[PDB]
Design a protein around this ligand. Structure first.
Ligand code: GLU
Ligand code: GLU
Lengths: 221, 221
């Protein structure tokens, strides 16, 4: 097809998004949608979810894809609308194997030095649970702070934390059973976008046919 | 407030919707949204989800509330759009206590006489799993068919089935551990509705603040 390409902003971490050029669960979901419509895409990495959402509202992007948590604050941003969610995720905690007795509930987060990645929902949850929040630029940085000793835990999306531990079994880090929150992931479109219905219908088809589950199993099963 | 009332279509069964005038989890969610905006409502019972969706598309209703499963086929209906989902439900099976050994998986549904309520997602799931589908007008009718012997099971939303058994412990009916599907519940608005963002933001607030969980616990905890 020689039709104008949709400008797709990409943000997020493994296993939902990997940067080569772009792969992961979120990319698999988007590509299945685009292919079903024979649409062309032009991918543009975004610095953060906030930057990406503004780019969609300002018309610089047609859609923002990735493991984007659907939150009240984000849904309130003028000019944008979320698609139906395609994944139900949880925000968890990564800690040293020796610290497992210390982290048994969210109440245990109070006053503990917790590392979080900037512009992620974890920043707000860590503040809400009264932790000693230490913001970092990326997950690697947050985990490097855990490997040193500045922090006692890293709060971030559970699938990303589990994926990380699986690439570094040598580290002896553990993802607690604690679920700080349950959050749905969705894509972001311009409000009243003429693409909204088509995208929702296709994402729902992928969801109900268990195709999204297959994508997830390929990266985290 | 003397502002024009929003026309709210109501459809569904307990514990999400009860008909006096209207109560239940779905009504609690909607009322919390309306109250936060100081909106006036005018409730109109709908015969079915399909009828209700058409009424929203045709402008007869401003919104359709209830335990409405967000499906690809419904999302594809012209002129409407679903809100963000507010509940994650499962479609289950109600069977006699003596039949528990017979229903251990969806594969066991093949050729079994299954009762379903017309215009519910269960009709499609029962057909998909190759059951001997017997459509009925309402849940009471489907269960009355189970109490007789025309059917070997009733396929319907799990929370409604559990609620039913709890009002009739004398019956000795059991809700199997089988989950035929996992489906999100949402409300239906007119496509590009000027109410969409406000409604989504409020429903998300209720969700994240655990208020929706409190509503559910009040009727099924
Ligand atoms: N789900 C997180 C982002 C997770 C990630 O960057 O992988 C958020 O929406 O803030
Ligand atoms: N969730 C079902 C309806 C359940 C009910 O009527 O209570 C559907 O969307 O078909």
């Amino acid at each position: 097809g020689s039709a104008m390409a949709l400008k797709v902003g990409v943000v997020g971490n493994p296993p939902f998004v990997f940067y080569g050029a772009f792969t992961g669960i979120s990319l698999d979901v988007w590509r299945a949608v685009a292919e079903s419509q024979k649409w062309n895409s032009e991918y543009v990495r975004q610095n953060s979810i906030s930057a990406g959402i503004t780019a969609v509202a300002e018309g610089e992007l047609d859609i923002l894809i990735g493991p984007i948590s659907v939150t009240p604050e984000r849904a309130a941003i003028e000019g944008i609308t979320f698609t139906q969610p395609y994944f139900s995720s949880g925000i968890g905690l990564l800690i040293p194997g020796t610290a497992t007795p210390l982290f048994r509930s969210v109440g245990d987060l109070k006053n503990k030095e917790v590392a979080v990645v900037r512009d992620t929902t974890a920043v707000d949850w860590a503040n809400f649970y009264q932790a000693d929040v230490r913001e970092t630029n990326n997950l690697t940085a947050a985990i490097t702070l855990l490997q040193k000793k500045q922090v006692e835990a890293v709060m971030f999306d559970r699938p990303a934390l589990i994926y990380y531990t699986r690439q570094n079994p040598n580290l002896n880090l553990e993802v607690t059973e604690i679920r700080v929150s349950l959050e749905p992931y969705g894509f972001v479109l311009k409000e009243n976008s003429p693409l909204q219905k088509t995208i929702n219908v296709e994402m729902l088809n992928l969801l109900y046919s268990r195709v999204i589950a297959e994508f997830t199993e390929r990266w985290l099963g």
